[PDB]
Amino acid sequence: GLTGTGVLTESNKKFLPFQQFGRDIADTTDAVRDPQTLEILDITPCSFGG
Amino acid sequence: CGDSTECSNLLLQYGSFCTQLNRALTGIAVEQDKNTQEVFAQVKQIYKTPPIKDFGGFNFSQILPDPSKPSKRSFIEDLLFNKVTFNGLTVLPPLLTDEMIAQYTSALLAGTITSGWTFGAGAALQIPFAMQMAYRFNGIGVTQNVLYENQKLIANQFNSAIGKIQDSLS
Amino acid sequence: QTRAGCLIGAEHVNNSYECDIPIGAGICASYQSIIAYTMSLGAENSVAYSNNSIAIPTNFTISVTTEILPVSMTKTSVDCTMYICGDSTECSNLLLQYGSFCTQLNRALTGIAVEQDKNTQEVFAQVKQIYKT
Amino acid sequence: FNGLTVLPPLLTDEMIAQYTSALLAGTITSGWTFG
Amino acid sequence: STASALGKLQNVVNQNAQALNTLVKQLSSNFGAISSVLNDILSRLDPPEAEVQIDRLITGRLQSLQTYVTQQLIRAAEIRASANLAATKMSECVLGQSKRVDFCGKGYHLMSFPQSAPHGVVFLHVTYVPAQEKNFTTAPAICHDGKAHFPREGVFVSNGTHWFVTQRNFYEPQIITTDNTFVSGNCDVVIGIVNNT
Amino acid sequence: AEVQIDRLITGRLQSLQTYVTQQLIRAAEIRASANLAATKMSECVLGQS
């Protein structure tokens, strides 16, 4: 139910056993936990620029 | 808008609204670059210091660049650098990297150590440091005899002050 | 691939000249084809320092240089109601309920014009009489 | 134009040229004394 | 011959013209209404909806005019600062000779001449630049008869065999005499003193 | 939904305008400081004041 775009990579963050996703600052999500495999993935925005 | 065709279509009817915003931001960036270039680019040649350093007893080792460090900075510059520490927004890098700024500072400092104020008008002319300091005292109403009789004490006081500056900063 | 991004359509060399078209991160490009290089701060020299040697000029030259400074700009004014409504009684009646909205703008524009006139008169009028050669 | 006006400057360029000529003749003939 | 030298005045003129052009161009925006023409809206609907339509145009045009006024204020402040700098330069480098280095000209200042420009001033600065240097050997004081001699103004120089006194900014040797030197102490504490007559 | 989209758009535009104005003011004061620094570098390093 949490929707967003970007590119997903493998991360090394250690979620405490009851969170579902994390955000760093200014309320922007960075890490998520896949509901099935139960691992932490990292999201970075798709490349853009002038 | 953020990837919304409907938002873009509704927004298109507001006319030229962000063209002037980008114009202003580009002007600000150009002004920053111009400010840096105006402040630091004041010499035409990159002067260097002789390998042998006997400046009448004065000691500039704390301010001269250090060849050992890769950044080619000095003690005070390293202390200053160490002491102080998106949804469509980008940050552009400065045109002049800090290595070139350090090179400009080193060139200016070598020029003012070796050639007095002469390099600021025309070509640099060499001068022993004691004579330049005698000129500087003569320019404030004190005869050069005072420096020529108190050189050692003057050098010791200068070294002590430049040593205390580093401790005060650190 | 540069610290400023990615660049296509130019060749990278190993020399260094004065910077023509600034690109960024200490590098920029020029035309010869188009070549991208690292900026050169200036010429290199090592002034001959010794503790019992000096250099003294023997001749001189006289140079004349220019400096350009702007001191003024055009004075403009804007009629608020004519621009925002344009000969419409209904528009004026609807706009009237906004309070004092354009009096401040006219005040600011008049101040700007007065400042331009003061700038010009202060910069140039610095003599009491009109001397003649 | 739809309600915008441009006002002429108070000092026409002839007077500015006269000021420059007076200043320049003064500095040629009298040095810095006239300042 | 060379053009593109009067960049600043042209830039100011272009900025003003562009601001005026965008301000007058902003008049053709719907701003979310049905049309940009006032009479067309007036002669197509009923007043209860007509006023709703007109409000959007009113607020949009007000916002644009506010932005234009703010930009004009900023540019006027910058122009005022530039004019103050120009006035200071005119006061200090035309009515007198300046000692502060590099304020007006590159070198030792001699004089300046003003000229007008459509929206500014042009200063012609005349400066003195030394050239054709030459190496010499120097000494800070002269020991003679057990006394130390220092130059009044100038510096001791040497052909390579003899010694002379010169002014600092132009080579003109002269014979060392008691008239252009003064005595203080004895030649025992000065580092680098040399023997002569 | 177009009404809500417009309501969001106007506020976002207002915020962008405020940020731009603040940046302009800060740039002006920074430029003044840079001019002072350049004058000091020219007058106190290249000569005696």
Ligand SMILES: *[C@@H]1O[C@H](CO)[C@@H](O[C@@H]2O[C@H](CO)[C@@H](O)[C@H](O)[C@H]2NC(C)=O)[C@H](O)[C@H]1NC(C)=O
């Ligand atoms: C959801 O169901 C899948 C399907 O069985 C589970 O995936 C298996 O998990 C076990 C646990 O070690 C592995 O040994 C199997 O190899 C997995 N099978 C696959 C990936 O096809 C998964 O663990 C379940 N998730 C839960 C229960 O949270």
Ligand SMILES: *[C@@H]1O[C@H](CO)[C@@H](O[C@@H]2O[C@H](CO)[C@@H](O)[C@H](O)[C@H]2NC(C)=O)[C@H](O)[C@H]1NC(C)=O
């Ligand atoms: C100039 O001052 C520096 C101190 O910053 C001197 O360097 C010290 O030299 C002594 C004696 O050789 C060493 O014991 C210290 O470890 C040095 N300090 C540092 C930080 O390197 C330097 O010798 C002085 N210059 C001269 C010519 O004596």
Ligand SMILES: *[C@@H]1O[C@H](CO)[C@@H](O[C@@H]2O[C@H](CO)[C@@H](O)[C@H](O)[C@H]2NC(C)=O)[C@H](O)[C@H]1NC(C)=O
């Ligand atoms: C002054 O004397 C020096 C030393 O004899 C002359 O030679 C220069 O010496 C410096 C350092 O020793 C070198 O960096 C230069 O390349 C030398 N110049 C030449 C042409 O060989 C020097 O030419 C003399 N004149 C001046 C104006 O310095």
Ligand SMILES: *[C@@H]1O[C@H](CO)[C@@H](O[C@@H]2O[C@H](CO)[C@@H](O)[C@H](O)[C@H]2NC(C)=O)[C@H](O)[C@H]1NC(C)=O
């Ligand atoms: C100082 O420089 C000037 C300018 O170069 C010299 O005047 C030149 O002298 C040569 C040879 O006599 C002439 O061919 C040139 O026409 C002169 N130039 C001008 C502009 O008249 C002058 O000789 C130099 N002084 C010394 C002592 O060398």
Ligand SMILES: *[C@@H]1O[C@H](CO)[C@@H](O[C@@H]2O[C@H](CO)[C@@H](O)[C@H](O)[C@H]2NC(C)=O)[C@H](O)[C@H]1NC(C)=O
């Ligand atoms: C030292 O300076 C003196 C004075 O200019 C030079 O000596 C003169 O040389 C000329 C040419 O040989 C003679 O005609 C004069 O009689 C000399 N003057 C005296 C007082 O003897 C001398 O050339 C300079 N030294 C060097 C190495 O050039």
Ligand SMILES: *[C@@H]1O[C@H](CO)[C@@H](O[C@@H]2O[C@H](CO)[C@@H](O)[C@H](O)[C@H]2NC(C)=O)[C@H](O)[C@H]1NC(C)=O
């Ligand atoms: C200027 O530098 C020279 C050379 O570095 C110094 O000359 C030295 O003087 C001492 C004591 O008189 C001698 O022991 C050395 O042998 C000299 N050096 C050479 C290479 O011969 C001189 O002392 C310095 N200071 C001056 C001239 O005031």
Ligand SMILES: *[C@@H]1O[C@H](CO)[C@@H](O[C@@H]2O[C@H](CO)[C@@H](O)[C@H](O)[C@H]2NC(C)=O)[C@H](O)[C@H]1NC(C)=O
């Ligand atoms: C300048 O002259 C004085 C005296 O003419 C020299 O002083 C003599 O130095 C020698 C060698 O050191 C001593 O043996 C004498 O006793 C000294 N005489 C006196 C009266 O003190 C002095 O050395 C000369 N200067 C130089 C640089 O050689």
Ligand SMILES: *[C@@H]1O[C@H](CO)[C@@H](O)[C@H](O)[C@H]1NC(C)=O
């Ligand atoms: C010269 O430039 C080429 C590519 O432009 C680079 O591969 C090389 O390392 C540079 N230096 C030398 C010494 O060839």
